């Protein structure tokens, strides 16, 4: 009926989404076999009697991340055709994932996308997870998303991008990889949610109060944002939203769709009983700058649009109590031309907890996705990483030798120049 | 068949329960072989547990308390380090109420009788005697071993000695306390104990 088809491309996409799928299995009471001992329509099909196969595709050019799932505990859970492995790795090139090796996978992958979309009309959208600094995360991501825009006309496209850090990078080719992705991300996606890494390191340092978590604990918290995002489709609520309304909620101009995230509460099970989580307190932690999942300082940022999805046993008026005081506060600066800037939806069912996870059982939760002019910092910083490294044609021959035209890096920057100016033009 | 399949407790459990299942099925719609949910076992037999007064108590005494097994060795330095903090936690947590809250069983990875009694003199909680087969059966059940001596069936070591395992009525691993684990909260992991939702029913 109504559903969303999810795409996982690149390693970062796979193992974030592998956490995202194991959260969804236990949300609807689906065993790893795929059985259950009108909830599960929007992420699962039903096969024969008692089964639930997912609405997903795994794509990677290396086997090593995707085949390891094939032999994991989620053996029978995925149909063995949409798990796709190439032969050799993309190896941190935009060019290689876009020109040479990326071509021979899109020819089979788009077919499976067609095979999954032709059952029921009224597709909600496309949830594609990828990294940006990665090789296959950008190149295969671009080629798949470009083809999808032409083939399927008008339906929405959600894209969670594991954005390169302001501070750490864990690769040298990141400024060359990031810039080139953007020029092919602007006119394809509809809602690009920017996620960071050391923010969640900083989150798990303070709030979670666990000394040494790894990528497996990054992914739980990421999975908790996605569940609360699409909580409205799965379950009834006092005031629900859709995934086709977000683009009408958040974007004022078609080129401005780079939004942040926030989540609360994020508390250890040990320190949980020192906070009875009220609606008055969770909303203020949502707006507190050391709780957002992007790491950009919003003090130099004029807010433009905000979209809060409350979860669990929350009544509508203490939301209205909280938002009254929020607007009158002068630490959270809204822009002049947008005097209304809130959407606040509500769902009934409180968030699940993973067994052996790092999340205590909470009764209410807030998830925030906001459009702000602080992203001018995220981009003007990035442009500086480019031209300083492009000062004397560092690493150029790798891209040149793989297939790209030298000089295409210029209009990619001139594109990002325009995205730099319009944010600064808006904020005045 | 939790937390592993190939454990002596579970092989005894399966044998006994489906013996009973077939008998009553023939005597009578009942699903063979029985679900692990439907199976019932007696975990600690008649003469296993013995307390601080050297008196055997039955299993029904442990109802209403968060019980945890403690795999310990007398001569292991890590266990020698962990012992005072576990004792202090037992002290404070059980003193601070008008209700018994948690209880510890002692399972011995120790070498011999003398050293076992010497180490057991320090503990104010229950213990299982070392010559009792239940010690080795519990070791193989929860996959704790100091060295690859007893074969493991494609599994690994769950942990090393020392370890604290919060258990349930049926041999369910309720939660693992990360003393020497993937997390390494030495002496601090004891605060992770959720005693409210893990009561020995």
């Amino acid at each position: 009926m109504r559903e969303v088809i999810s795409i996982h491309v690149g390693q970062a996409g796979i193992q974030i989404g592998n956490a995202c799928w194991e959260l969804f299995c236990l949300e609807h009471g689906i065993q790893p076999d795929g059985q259950m001992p009108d909830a599960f329509n929007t992420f699962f099909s039903e096969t024969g009697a008692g089964k639930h196969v997912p609405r997903c595709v795994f794509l990677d050019l290396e086997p090593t991340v995707v085949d390891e799932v094939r032999t994991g505990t989620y053996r029978h859970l995925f149909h063995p055709e949409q798990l796709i492995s190439g032969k050799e790795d993309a190896a941190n090139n935009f060019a290689r994932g876009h020109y040479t090796i990326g071509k021979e996978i899109v020819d089979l992958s788009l077919d499976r996308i067609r095979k999954l979309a032709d059952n029921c009309t009224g597709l909600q959208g496309f949830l594609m997870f990828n990294a940006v600094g990665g090789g296959t995360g950008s190149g295969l991501g671009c080629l798949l998303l470009e083809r999808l825009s032409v083939d399927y006309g008008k339906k929405s496209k959600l894209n969670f991008c594991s954005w390169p850090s302001p501070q750490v990078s864990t690769a040298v080719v990141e400024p060359y990889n990031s810039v080139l992705s953007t020029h092919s991300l602007l006119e394809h996606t509809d809602v690009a949610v920017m996620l960071d890494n050391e923010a969640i390191y900083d989150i798990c340092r303070r709030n979670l109060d666990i000394e040494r978590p790894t990528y497996t604990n990054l992914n739980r918290l990421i999975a908790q944002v996605i569940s609360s995002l699409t909580a409205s489709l799965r379950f009834d609520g006092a005031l629900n939203v859709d995934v086709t309304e977000f683009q009408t909620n958040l974007v004022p101009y078609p080129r401005i769709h780079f939004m942040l995230s926030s989540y609360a509460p994020i508390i250890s099970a040990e320190k949980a009983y020192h906070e009875q989580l009220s609606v008055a307190e969770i909303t203020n932690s949502a707006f507190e700058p050391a709780s957002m999942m992007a790491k950009c300082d919003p003090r130099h940022g004029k807010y433009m649009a905000c979209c809060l999805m409350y979860r669990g046993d929350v009544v509508p008026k203490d939301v209205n109590a909280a938002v009254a005081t929020i607007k009158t506060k002068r630490t959270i600066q809204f822009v002049d031309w947008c005097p209304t800037g809130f959407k606040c939806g509500i769902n009934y069912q409180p968030p699940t907890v993973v067994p052996g996870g790092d999340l205590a059982k909470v009764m209410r939760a807030v998830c925030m996705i906001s459009n702000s002019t602080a992203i001018a910092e995220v981009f003007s910083r990035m442009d500086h990483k480019f031209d300083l490294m492009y000062a004397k044609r560092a690493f150029v021959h790798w891209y040149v030798g793989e297939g790209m035209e030298e000089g295409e890096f210029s209009e990619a920057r001139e594109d990002l120049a325009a995205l730099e100016k319009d944010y600064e033009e808006v904020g005045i | 068949s939790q937390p592993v399949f190939a454990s002596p407790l579970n092989v005894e459990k399966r044998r006994l329960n489906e013996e009973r299942a077939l008998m009553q099925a023939q005597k009578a719609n009942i699903q063979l072989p029985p679900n692990y949910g439907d199976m019932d076992l007696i975990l600690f037999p008649e003469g296993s547990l013995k307390n601080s007064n050297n008196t055997v108590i039955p299993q029904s005494h442990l109802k209403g308390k968060s019980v945890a097994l403690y795999f310990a060795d007398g001569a292991d330095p890590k266990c020698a380090s962990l012992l005072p903090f576990l004792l202090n936690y037992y002290r404070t947590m059980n003193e601070g109420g008008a209700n018994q809250k948690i209880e510890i069983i002692f399972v011995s990875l120790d070498r011999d009788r003398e050293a076992f009694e010497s180490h057991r003199a320090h503990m104010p909680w229950l213990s299982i005697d070392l010559e009792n087969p239940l010690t080795e059966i519990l070791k193989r059940h929860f996959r704790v071993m100091k060295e690859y001596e007893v074969p493991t069936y494609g599994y690994g070591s769950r942990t090393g000695v020392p370890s604290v395992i919060v258990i349930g009525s049926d041999g369910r691993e309720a939660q693992f306390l990360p003393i020497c684990s993937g997390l390494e909260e030495g002496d601090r992991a004891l605060l992770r104990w959720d005693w409210r939702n893990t009561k020995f029913a």
């Binding site: 065993q31 505990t73 052996g356 | 690994g156």
Partner: peptide, 22 residues
């Protein structure tokens, strides 16, 4: 010639058979 290696991946460790919601 080896006696067996018994450290285990984080993925295998923790995404295990949870008790199901109905």
């Amino acid at each position: 010639p080896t006696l067996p290696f018994n450290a285990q991946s984080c993925y295998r460790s923790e995404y295990v058979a949870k008790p199901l919601p109905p």
